Design an enzyme around this catalytic site. Structure first.
Site, PDB file in Angstrom:
ATOM      1  N   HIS B  41       1.969  23.571  -6.248  1.00 31.17           N
ATOM      2  CA  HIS B  41       1.633  24.891  -5.721  1.00 31.17           C
ATOM      3  C   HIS B  41       1.932  26.015  -6.708  1.00 31.17           C
ATOM      4  O   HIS B  41       1.697  27.178  -6.378  1.00 31.17           O
ATOM      5  CB  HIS B  41       2.321  25.149  -4.362  1.00 31.17           C
ATOM      6  CG  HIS B  41       3.815  25.299  -4.420  1.00 31.17           C
ATOM      7  ND1 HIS B  41       4.671  24.464  -3.729  1.00 31.17           N
ATOM      8  CD2 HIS B  41       4.603  26.221  -5.028  1.00 31.17           C
ATOM      9  CE1 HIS B  41       5.924  24.842  -3.938  1.00 31.17           C
ATOM     10  NE2 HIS B  41       5.913  25.906  -4.723  1.00 31.17           N
ATOM     11  N   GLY B 143      12.052  31.072  -5.908  1.00 35.20           N
ATOM     12  CA  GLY B 143      12.102  30.660  -7.300  1.00 35.20           C
ATOM     13  C   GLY B 143      12.820  29.355  -7.572  1.00 35.20           C
ATOM     14  O   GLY B 143      12.916  28.956  -8.743  1.00 35.20           O
ATOM     15  N   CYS B 145      11.992  26.323  -6.336  1.00 31.86           N
ATOM     16  CA  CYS B 145      11.053  25.207  -6.383  1.00 31.86           C
ATOM     17  C   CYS B 145      11.039  24.540  -7.750  1.00 31.86           C
ATOM     18  O   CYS B 145      11.209  25.193  -8.781  1.00 31.86           O
ATOM     19  CB  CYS B 145       9.653  25.688  -6.028  1.00 31.86           C
ATOM     20  SG  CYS B 145       9.491  25.936  -4.283  1.00 31.86           S
TER      21      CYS B 145
HETATM   22  C1  LIG Z   1       9.785  27.772  -4.189  1.00 34.12           C
HETATM   23  O1  LIG Z   1      10.914  28.266  -4.877  1.00 34.12           O
HETATM   24  C2  LIG Z   1       9.746  28.215  -2.716  1.00 34.12           C
HETATM   25  C3  LIG Z   1      10.977  27.634  -2.002  1.00 34.12           C
HETATM   26  C4  LIG Z   1      11.479  28.454  -0.820  1.00 34.12           C
HETATM   27  C5  LIG Z   1      11.628  29.972  -1.037  1.00 34.12           C
HETATM   28  C6  LIG Z   1      12.795  30.367  -0.110  1.00 34.12           C
HETATM   29  N1  LIG Z   1      13.578  29.128  -0.045  1.00 34.12           N
HETATM   30  C7  LIG Z   1      12.888  28.024  -0.415  1.00 34.12           C
HETATM   31  O2  LIG Z   1      13.329  26.868  -0.448  1.00 34.12           O
HETATM   32  N2  LIG Z   1       8.527  27.745  -2.056  1.00 34.12           N
HETATM   33  C8  LIG Z   1       7.677  28.360  -1.196  1.00 34.12           C
HETATM   34  O3  LIG Z   1       7.717  29.593  -1.064  1.00 34.12           O
HETATM   35  C9  LIG Z   1       6.660  27.525  -0.377  1.00 34.12           C
HETATM   36  C10 LIG Z   1       5.276  27.574  -1.066  1.00 34.12           C
HETATM   37  C11 LIG Z   1       4.295  26.416  -0.758  1.00 34.12           C
HETATM   38  C12 LIG Z   1       4.782  25.423   0.307  1.00 34.12           C
HETATM   39  C13 LIG Z   1       2.936  26.999  -0.339  1.00 34.12           C
HETATM   40  N3  LIG Z   1       6.689  27.956   1.020  1.00 34.12           N
HETATM   41  C14 LIG Z   1       7.799  28.131   1.787  1.00 34.12           C
HETATM   42  O4  LIG Z   1       8.891  27.580   1.661  1.00 34.12           O
HETATM   43  O5  LIG Z   1       7.538  29.056   2.754  1.00 34.12           O
HETATM   44  C15 LIG Z   1       7.141  28.521   4.053  1.00 34.12           C
HETATM   45  C16 LIG Z   1       8.200  28.920   5.044  1.00 34.12           C
HETATM   46  C17 LIG Z   1       7.955  28.820   6.421  1.00 34.12           C
HETATM   47  C18 LIG Z   1       8.942  29.181   7.343  1.00 34.12           C
HETATM   48  C19 LIG Z   1      10.185  29.642   6.894  1.00 34.12           C
HETATM   49  C20 LIG Z   1      10.438  29.745   5.522  1.00 34.12           C
HETATM   50  C21 LIG Z   1       9.448  29.388   4.603  1.00 34.12           C
END
Ligand SMILES: *[C@H](O)[C@H](C[C@@H]1CCNC1=O)NC(=O)[C@H](CC(C)C)NC(=O)OCc1ccccc1
Ligand SMILES: *[C@H](O)[C@H](C[C@@H]1CCNC1=O)NC(=O)[C@H](CC(C)C)NC(=O)OCc1ccccc1
EC number: 3.4.19.12
Lengths: 305, 305
Positions: B41, B143, B145
């Site tokens: 992603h 950040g 990921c």
């Molecule tokens: C990459 O660093 C990030 C990891 C998240 C950011 C906050 N804590 C984490 O572990 N990844 C994303 O932003 C990810 C992107 C793809 C799956 C499209 N989406 C994500 O984690 O957001 C979805 C979400 C849904 C409900 C609550 C929290 C997040």
């Protein structure tokens, strides 16, 4: 989000660990430039640990009595000296993996990472705090002496602890200039740690981390004064709270919009009513081994180079 | 003695972390030999995360769309491919710090260390378990990921996890072949983790660690059968216990001379009467994130080379 007992990455320290053998006693040493630092009781025999005379023991030794091993490489000791409770072994090769470093002495309530080692080999890393009675609650077996504690500051490793002994379930050691934390000596005698207390500023920083992560059930609308709080804290063996602590907690109150003295009122209730079977950040006890800076670092995300 | 949530030394992994930028999205990558692995992603835009078509997104990209930075050094991407949910970026320089490694897929109940990173830079290390619902309870900010999870086996780093997303307070990711743990997909939709349960074999291993360290108050003279225990465990949302688990706990029962089914009788009492305000190894809850092997390693002292 989330909250974990988090240690510093240990890579820069792993490159400085060596095995130090003198006689039939082997422990770990710290190798920076051309000096290896290690506990001075490596020169004791099993018939001396009761009441050693380290100056006598050291004059009866020569350089070749000290086997220093870095991996499968041997380092030649070309000189030695004693500095308080540590031995400094001068060797012929400067450690090429020497990072930028300083030696610092920490205060009760501050935290650091411990790289536990055996036979010069890194085994595990964990975070702990220096207790108000100058012990740490570590995890150490025979052969762990010489393992070091450290913080990382941007690019500089600050070495603050070297492990020397276990008392009754807890652990005592020196700074890297060889001076003990607490009133302990490096001999086997009947010495005991004083009374431990709970680090109040750290408990408050952890309650803020809880709020930041969604745990809010313990909040309330009351406020208290610094003085009214410290009267309750005394009864439960909590360290008294100073205006310095309030200021340090400032960044966290600003981020959550909850005043420090508001949060003290919630802590007062938790101390008098208890947890009532609920948890905070996955714990059923009040946690006191995160500093205000640990919370900021983890709930905001400081890296290191 | 003592008992701490202990992570593996991270030095061998820190040397493999890099920053991967595509567009205005930056995350971490894992650099082994001449391949950089990272979440796929990274090629999404902020207007795609709802329902991306990654094959379409990838064909519209060229190598020069991928900025790979190792410290202050830039790596030239000379090829890319997709493997399930990860991107493999072929670069012109093989990582000289590549350790011996394998890619393994772990099972619920097993533990590993996480090296949390931001902008290619190691920030912290901590230990956690893969839950029965295939999430982990981590600590990750924006950040993070591409951060990886790993075990160390003598000299080989076993990579088992790459971080991809946060659900509702918990964290989900893939193995290093790009296949998700659990029924999750890497898009922003309304997906939720199933019901978590307590890892029973791990709780028993932790009670043995307690006995090894002097905590004995919860023991009793009763025994039970595997079947009578599993009837109580079901009611409290504990994983059922198998004869495989008993055998795995064998080394710990031998060291303490307390039979596995004896210890199950104590756990049954703790589940029905509660802790009654006492603690075990500094905790007021039953801890389930140490495997039988973690206890052996820490209470006996395995190093790594
Ligand atoms: C990459 O660093 C990030 C990891 C998240 C950011 C906050 N804590 C984490 O572990 N990844 C994303 O932003 C990810 C992107 C793809 C799956 C499209 N989406 C994500 O984690 O957001 C979805 C979400 C849904 C409900 C609550 C929290 C997040
Ligand atoms: C060095 O690795 C070792 C550290 C101990 C071994 C078990 N866990 C530890 O942290 N050091 C010693 O054996 C030390 C030697 C000098 C101080 C003479 N003595 C020590 O820790 O034993 C004293 C003791 C008294 C009461 C309970 C436990 C130990």
């Amino acid at each position: 989000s989330g909250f974990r007992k988090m240690a510093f990455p240990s890579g820069k320290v792993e490159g400085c660990m060596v095995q130090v053998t003198c006689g039939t006693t082997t422990l770990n040493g710290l190798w920076l430039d051309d000096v290896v630092y290690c506990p001075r009781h490596v020169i004791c025999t099993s018939e001396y640990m009761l009441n050693p005379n380290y100056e006598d023991l050291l004059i009866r030794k020569s350089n070749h009595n000290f086997l220093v091993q870095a991996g499968n490489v041997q380092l030649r000791v070309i000189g030695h000296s004693m500095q308080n409770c540590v031995l400094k072994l001068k060797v012929d090769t400067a450690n090429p993996k020497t990072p930028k470093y300083k030696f610092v002495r920490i205060q009760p309530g501050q935290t650091f990472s411990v790289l536990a080692c055996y036979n010069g080999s890194p085994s595990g890393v964990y975070q702990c705090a220096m207790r108000p009675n100058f012990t740490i609650k570590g995890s150490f077996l025979n052969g762990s002496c010489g393992s070091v504690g450290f913080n990382i500051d941007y690019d500089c490793v600050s070495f603050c602890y070297m492990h020397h002994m276990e008392l009754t379930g807890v652990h005592a050691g020196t700074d890297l200039e060889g001076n003990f934390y607490g009133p302990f000596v490096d001999r086997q005698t009947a010495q005991a740690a004083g009374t431990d207390t709970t680090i109040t500023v750290n408990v408050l920083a952890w309650l803020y981390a809880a709020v930041i992560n969604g745990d809010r059930w313990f909040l309330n609308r009351f406020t208290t004064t610094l003085n009214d709080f410290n009267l309750v804290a005394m009864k439960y063996n909590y360290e008294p709270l100073t205006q310095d602590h309030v200021d340090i907690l400032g960044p966290l109150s600003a981020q959550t919009g909850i005043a420090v003295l508001d949060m003290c009122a919630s802590l007062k209730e938790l101390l008098q009513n208890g947890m009532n079977g609920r948890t905070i950040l996955g714990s059923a006890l009040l946690e006191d081994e995160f500093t205000p800076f640990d919370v900021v670092r983890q709930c905001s995300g400081v890296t290191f180079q």
